[PDB]
Write a protein that binds this ligand. Structure first.
Ligand SMILES: [Mg+2]
Ligand SMILES: [Mg+2]
Ligand SMILES: [Mg+2]
Ligand SMILES: [Mg+2]
Ligand SMILES: [Mg+2]
Ligand SMILES: [Mg+2]
Ligand SMILES: [Mg+2]
Ligand SMILES: [Mg+2]
Ligand SMILES: [Mg+2]
Ligand SMILES: [Mg+2]
Ligand SMILES: [Mg+2]
Ligand SMILES: [Mg+2]
Ligand SMILES: [Mg+2]
Ligand SMILES: [Mg+2]
Ligand SMILES: [Mg+2]
Ligand SMILES: [Mg+2]
Ligand SMILES: [Mg+2]
Ligand SMILES: [Mg+2]
Ligand SMILES: [Mg+2]
Ligand SMILES: [Mg+2]
Ligand SMILES: [Mg+2]
Ligand SMILES: [Mg+2]
Ligand SMILES: [Mg+2]
Ligand SMILES: [Mg+2]
Ligand SMILES: [Mg+2]
Ligand SMILES: [Mg+2]
Ligand SMILES: [Mg+2]
Ligand SMILES: [Mg+2]
Ligand SMILES: [Mg+2]
Ligand SMILES: [Mg+2]
Ligand SMILES: [Mg+2]
Ligand SMILES: [Mg+2]
Ligand SMILES: [Mg+2]
Ligand SMILES: [Mg+2]
Ligand SMILES: [Mg+2]
Ligand SMILES: [Mg+2]
Ligand SMILES: [Mg+2]
Ligand SMILES: [Mg+2]
Ligand SMILES: [Mg+2]
Ligand SMILES: [Mg+2]
Ligand SMILES: [Mg+2]
Ligand SMILES: [Mg+2]
Ligand SMILES: [Mg+2]
Lengths: 119, 82
RNA sequence: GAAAGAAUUAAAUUAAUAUAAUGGUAUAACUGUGCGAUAAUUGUAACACAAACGAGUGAAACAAGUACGUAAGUAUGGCAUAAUGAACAAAUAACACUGAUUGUAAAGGUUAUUGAUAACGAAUAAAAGUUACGCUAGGGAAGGGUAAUAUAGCGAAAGAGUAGAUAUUGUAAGCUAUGUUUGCCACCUUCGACUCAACAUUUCCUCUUGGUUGUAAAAGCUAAGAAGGGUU
RNA sequence: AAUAUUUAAAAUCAAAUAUAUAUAUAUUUGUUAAUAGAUAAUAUACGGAUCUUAAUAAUAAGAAUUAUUUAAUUCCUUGGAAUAUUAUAUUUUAAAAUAUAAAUACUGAAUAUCUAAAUAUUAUUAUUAUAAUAAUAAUAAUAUGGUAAUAGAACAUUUAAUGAUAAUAUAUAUUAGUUAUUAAUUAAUAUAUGUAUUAAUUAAAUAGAGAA
RNA sequence: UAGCCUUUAUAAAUAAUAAUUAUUAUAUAAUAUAUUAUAUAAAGAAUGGUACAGCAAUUAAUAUAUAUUAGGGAACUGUUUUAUUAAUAAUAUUAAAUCUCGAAAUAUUUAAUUAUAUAUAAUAAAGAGUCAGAUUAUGUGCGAUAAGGUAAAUAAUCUAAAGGGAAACAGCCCAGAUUAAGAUAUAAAGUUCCUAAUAAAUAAUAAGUGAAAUAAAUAUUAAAAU
RNA sequence: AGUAUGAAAAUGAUUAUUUUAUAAGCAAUCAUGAAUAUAUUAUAUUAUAUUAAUGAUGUACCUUUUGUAUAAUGGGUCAGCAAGUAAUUAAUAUUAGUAAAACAAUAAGUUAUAAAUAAAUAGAAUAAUAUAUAUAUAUAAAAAAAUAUAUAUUU
């Protein structure tokens, strides 16, 4: 390993802030996707946009992907994840069975929220 | 109602499968805006690219000409002929 | 209540399958039996699997004939996947297609079959070595990485040490450090002697110190600080 | 207090969220630190400087390390309100009261938008003279890195055909300007020629050299 | 030759890409134990046998004052028993590239619908170049769970890619250069000075540990819970 | 190796302007003082031109390579020269001429106009779109497989 890839094993405080922001943005995209479906269904029933937003009942999504993406167990929200899962991923060939999240290729884009329960 | 979709992040390093999902959505260069009629079919596609895009629900649809006129800056003058 | 029949359910593919392994098979593809020896036949074969080409695999359907079955129907070899070889030149037979002036013929043609190129898409019918006396056009089509090995340390202590594992010694296994030996990868195509040495300390001597029922003294063993000077 | 274990959110406890909703169910989150071990050869090597705070005392410093967070802190649920704060103006006695500003932290590319320009294409217009056309200019949208390679269009030199003008011109060279500029032009200067195979359309190349 | 690229065109062309509906169940209402509509839950039409999980059959391993057969000495005194050992039976516990009784996500893939039409496929006529690849991440064969090693599989980048960041950097994080300008947003990354940019909250460190390449077994000290 | 001209470059000496004797690397780009020279509209608080104050950025060019500043190959410099050309054929694309014909005319030839079969004496709706017809295998003839032909004017 002569070639030097000086990638540190820990993140700076600023990388952590950006990571938390990126997770929140993804959650907000999911939150907005459901909102549109609820509003569109309500308009189909006859309601208007305003009352749809103020409706007490919120129509939950029926698609498999959106239904699971709204489950905290499957896709936890940033305020729900643990600090370890925010910044550390699971690698089975590393001491501690964990490695820095920034070492995952395209970590900024890819989403890894869930780790095995005991790892 | 409609979805307002913005290609926040670029597609330089995304796998070709994700690129196909985005291309079929009408999004082009980074920062492009397209208004999509809310539809369970669209919601699924946006769900798969939930990272690279930013989605906000909107009441109406803005044609590209309307968006341009809303993007023009404000010149600080009125020309007086002669 | 009893006898017989049709049988049902559970288990079974571990036995058996011509032949390796895999998949399948009791509704049997396995076994027994009658007829049979027939489809182990004949001209068109669309469409698919596979696929660079050459090739390869399944096969609906139309037409002629055969075997079995009362009939429905089945049979274009083997439960399936291996059991193979292009052209060229020759050989045999059939067709009646050409027949170099005409008639024959000779010769070619279509159809069916034959022989091995195992370096198995087969360069010829037919071909081994030596060169340090060598030549031409090209490519590299000690440093670096690793540390099995090697050196050294650390953890634990089986056992010696007259007694007591830890004064000294420390099996075999464990965790490490260096890149000083033997290796491995191919990114990168001279051993010794003379002269002068510079640097490190993992200290051979000189300086200070700790332990040594195994420091009585002197000589010694082990260890810590120490690279100023010296080391045929 | 002494002794013996582990360092755990699995179980338990606490808190948050979604459903039936004063409760219950379900989901999510929360369980140690320092030192020694510590290791070689040109030269200390976090990139370097350098970084741990201190009352008397400054208009004023007190990690620039590690861990979890915020964008001044708190309630409702990105946004609203209140409360510690800085600065200023007015009034009153260096202090008190009222009023205003700050709640997007900032840097950051050849990213995106805006501001202009060029080419191509799709769709609409305008001016001028296969007019269903050509040239030019507008508006909206999309595109414009690139080796091997493919396709389109142009420029310089020379030759051949046609081809006015002329020392108040032509050719060449230097300098300074112009045109979105490998080119051609304006002016000045210098030298040759009573003078373009000149502008432009074709046809051909001994048609372009830091690379052997 | 195929694969990947290019030029010109053809319509009776959307056939391309992407996602959704499909399925099971619960609750409410309408209709005749069933159908319909609405809401909700479930990794949600069809194909599969990897991870995981397990010891089913196959291949292996361990232990039983458990039981039986046989072997051997002793006791009993030739009997049975005992001391036992191997095998089987029973119970309990384990693992495997060529085991999967259970079983994911990704994946293969289907009709209709919707969205991409300044967009895809298919087809016809003509041209190439390439057939020495490299690194990173993941799951493996060989090696020794060594190599900037070797061979393949998936994705990205370099090859052929400017710019920002990692001091310097082909392969890493961003982000793709028509030409201008420079107002505004910014990505990765940063804000004491070198160097463009900052103020805070709650705990720990006293070792300059650390501050952009984490060095292990172990020992000491101290802190929480039982 | 003709004769004239010759401010073509490389190269040498000298002079003129500017910079340079406390500062370190493809010698340039940008930012920016200062000095100097020209300027017949510097009206100037002016415009250009030259110049290593000072600051930031900046790892020569080509070839071969997965990959080069590479301590991989080639280059002292400048000028001249130095590489996809021709002949005979074939196939495609655009335009032009003519057109069920075209070239060429003296004849001859070539191509197209009929598709097949190894080949032969065979060769396209008996009444309409393939269900008809021609050829090849087969037959008595059909069906079957492949290609081609026809719905005022022959392509
Ligand atoms: Mg058989
Ligand atoms: Mg079997
Ligand atoms: Mg296929
Ligand atoms: Mg084929
Ligand atoms: Mg049989
Ligand atoms: Mg031969
Ligand atoms: Mg005859
Ligand atoms: Mg004869
Ligand atoms: Mg004969
Ligand atoms: Mg031979
Ligand atoms: Mg000899
Ligand atoms: Mg070495
Ligand atoms: Mg002993
Ligand atoms: Mg040993
Ligand atoms: Mg020492
Ligand atoms: Mg002594
Ligand atoms: Mg001294
Ligand atoms: Mg829990
Ligand atoms: Mg050092
Ligand atoms: Mg841009
Ligand atoms: Mg280009
Ligand atoms: Mg030439
Ligand atoms: Mg030259
Ligand atoms: Mg040049
Ligand atoms: Mg090819
Ligand atoms: Mg479709
Ligand atoms: Mg396997
Ligand atoms: Mg199974
Ligand atoms: Mg190869
Ligand atoms: Mg390699
Ligand atoms: Mg190459
Ligand atoms: Mg780059
Ligand atoms: Mg690319
Ligand atoms: Mg671009
Ligand atoms: Mg340090
Ligand atoms: Mg830095
Ligand atoms: Mg000076
Ligand atoms: Mg120097
Ligand atoms: Mg090489
Ligand atoms: Mg380089
Ligand atoms: Mg060189
Ligand atoms: Mg050099
Ligand atoms: Mg040289």
């Amino acid at each position: 390993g002569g070639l030097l890839w000086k990638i540190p094993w820990r993140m700076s405080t600023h990388q952590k802030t950006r990571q938390r922001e990126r997770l929140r943005n993804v959650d907000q995209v999911i939150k907005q996707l459901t909102l549109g479906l609820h509003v569109q269904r309500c308009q189909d029933k006859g309601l208007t946009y305003q009352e749809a937003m103020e409706s007490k009942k919120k129509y939950k999504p029926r698609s498999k992907s959106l239904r699971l993406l709204n489950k905290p167990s499957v896709f936890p929200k940033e305020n729900q994840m643990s600090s370890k899962d925010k910044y550390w991923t699971f690698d089975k060939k590393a001491v501690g069975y964990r490695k820095g999240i920034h070492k995952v290729p395209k970590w900024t884009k890819i989403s890894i929220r869930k780790a095995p329960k005991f790892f | 109602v409609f979805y307002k979709v913005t290609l926040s992040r670029s597609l330089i390093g995304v796998p070709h499968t994700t690129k196909s999902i985005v291309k079929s959505l009408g999004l082009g260069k980074r920062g492009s805006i397209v208004y999509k009629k809310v539809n369970p079919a669209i919601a699924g596609s946006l769900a798969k690219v939930k990272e690279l895009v930013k989605v906000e629900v909107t009441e109406h649809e803005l044609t590209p000409s309307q968006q341009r006129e809303l993007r023009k800056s404000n010149p600080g003058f009125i020309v007086e002929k002669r």
